[PDB]
């Protein structure tokens, strides 16, 4: 070990065989304005798309 | 298979002797071997390490002169060298299998080029260089690497003065000394030991 | 492996200073001025391998103009009449016949006038 992964990136981006999982923003603390249809569709654990991958796994020391 | 000067064949394996010559792997092994025998004993000094050089030489404006922060800058002739060396290592990793497979393809070329010579046993009597010269001159043999199964002290004391002869054991042989000497003398016990080691 | 670069720097400067010899002053004897003069000479020489083909053509055309007007014809009427006919003969050898072989040039301008252009 001579490369330090960013610890805030490791709590945010868990790696699977399908990519790097993350959760969504906006499901915190203002949840009456939102419809159920918006709160239902930020609930899961999405993937991380192409524009973000190189930056995140450069932060998570994997590039 | 391989011929012995003592009138018989020895029937070697087609794996240790008589495989294809991987020129790339043998070249990697000889570059690795010549790297592992280099000592990195040098250093220069950087701009921190050359003596003195604390003050700015002049003030930065008014002097009409170019702009310096120390006498010992690497642009200056007193100053340091810019990417000054420190004692490093040049020893690289060759795999165990890659080593053994570069060996198996230079014993094969020592066979094909008629450069390998198998004898039944090679033993000198006395620690005399003249005796070992006479024993090699029967074989018509100058500039030879003698590989025995274990180096005897008589065979070691002779030929450690002799100019173009080297006496090694099987463990102590290397790709550079196999390719270097113009002929390679091995005993039958050395061919047994090479089949044990190399496969 | 420290390598001392003063033996190759010298030969490269000798090459540039040899290419610059014949020039005025520091153009021929100091490197930072000789180098620019050699590069500039090279640009002009590239440009002038083109303008050589431009300048010789104009001299041929001017000599053919002068030779044709002695026989009562322009340059342009001569070049038109030498294509109502078919001469395939160029400005170089027509200028050469304009100076040297004047009776042959007179024969050529009469065969251009014969085609009435």
């Amino acid at each position: 070990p001579k490369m330090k992964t960013k610890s805030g990136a490791a709590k945010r981006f868990k790696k699977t065989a399908g990519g790097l999982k993350h959760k969504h923003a906006f499901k915190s603390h203002i949840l009456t304005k939102m419809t159920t249809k918006r709160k239902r569709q930020l609930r899961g654990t999405s993937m991380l798309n192409k524009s973000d991958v190189a930056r995140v796994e450069r932060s998570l020391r994997l590039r | 298979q391989l011929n012995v000067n003592g009138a018989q064949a020895i029937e070697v394996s087609e794996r240790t002797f008589g495989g294809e010559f991987n020129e790339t792997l043998v070249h990697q092994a000889v570059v690795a071997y010549m790297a592992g025998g280099r000592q990195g004993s040098k250093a220069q000094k950087t701009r921190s390490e050359v003596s003195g050089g604390g003050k700015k030489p002049w003030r930065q404006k008014g002097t009409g002169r170019a702009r310096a922060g120390t006498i010992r800058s690497p642009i200056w002739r007193g100053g340091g060298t810019t990417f000054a060396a420190k004692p490093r290592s040049h020893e690289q990793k060759l795999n165990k299998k890659m080593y053994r497979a570069a060996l198996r393809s230079i014993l094969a070329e020592l066979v094909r080029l008629d450069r390998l010579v198998v004898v039944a046993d090679f033993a000198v009597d006395a620690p005399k260089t003249k005796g070992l010269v006479a024993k090699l001159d029967t074989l018509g043999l100058k500039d030879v690497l003698i590989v025995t199964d274990g180096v005897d002290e008589n065979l070691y004391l002779a030929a450690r003065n002799l100019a173009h002869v080297d006496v090694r054991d099987v463990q102590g042989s290397d790709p550079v000394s196999l390719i270097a000497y113009d002929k390679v003398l091995v005993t039958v016990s050395a061919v047994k030991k090479f089949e044990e080691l190399l496969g | 492996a420290r390598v001392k670069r003063g033996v190759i720097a010298r030969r490269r400067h000798k090459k540039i200073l040899k290419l610059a010899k014949g020039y005025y002053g520091a153009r021929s004897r100091v490197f930072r001025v000789a180098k620019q003069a050699v590069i500039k000479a090279g640009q002009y020489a590239y440009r002038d391998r083109r303008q050589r083909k431009r300048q010789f053509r104009a001299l041929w055309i001017a000599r053919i103009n002068a030779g044709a007007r002695q026989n009562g014809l322009s340059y342009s009427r001569l070049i038109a009449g030498l294509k109502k006919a078919a001469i395939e003969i160029d400005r170089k050898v027509l200028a050469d016949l304009a100076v040297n072989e004047k009776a042959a040039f007179t024969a050529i301008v009469e065969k251009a006038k014969a085609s009435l252009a």
């Binding site: 960013k6 990136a9 923003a25 450069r58 932060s59 | 020129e23 390719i179 | -």
Partner: protein, 143 residues
């Protein structure tokens, strides 16, 4: 000969160097461009940094815990159970081969191939298909 050997065409490369002349391809800048941060010495952009907006690793939430239960967990698939010696698959037996680390304690066997032999699995959990494929080809199971 030491005089004669080279490597494969394409195995070493020349290591082109920046800053050696203008007819080399990398003069006067060395591939760095012109003024700005990423042409200076130490001209690095820090990892994650998006120019000053909130980067992805601070804009998305944190989502879970790591289990300390599973640091000593293990999985050994059915392709490997023929590789132990002695017709028994035990925890120490799976450590005698290098099939599983030291400091592992819990092994599940899952179905990823063919079990090969008739082995006995003491103290080792197995999935449904893997218990089926072990007991099919002569295996047994106790604890």
């Amino acid at each position: 000969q030491l005089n004669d050997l080279r490597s494969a065409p394409g195995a070493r490369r020349e290591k082109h160097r920046p800053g050696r002349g203008i007819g080399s391809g990398l003069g006067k800048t060395g591939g760095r461009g012109h003024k700005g941060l990423t042409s200076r010495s130490g001209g690095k952009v820090a990892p994650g940094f998006e120019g000053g907006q909130q980067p992805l690793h601070r804009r998305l939430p944190k989502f879970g815990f790591v289990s300390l239960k599973a640091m000593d967990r293990a999985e050994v698939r059915t392709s490997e159970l023929a590789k132990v010696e002695g017709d028994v698959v035990s925890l120490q037996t799976l450590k005698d081969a290098n099939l599983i680390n030291q400091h592992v304690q819990r092994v599940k066997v899952m179905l990823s191939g063919e079990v090969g032999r008739a082995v006995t699995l003491k103290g080792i959990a197995a999935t449904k298909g893997a218990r089926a494929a072990i007991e099919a080809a002569g295996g047994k199971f106790e604890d």
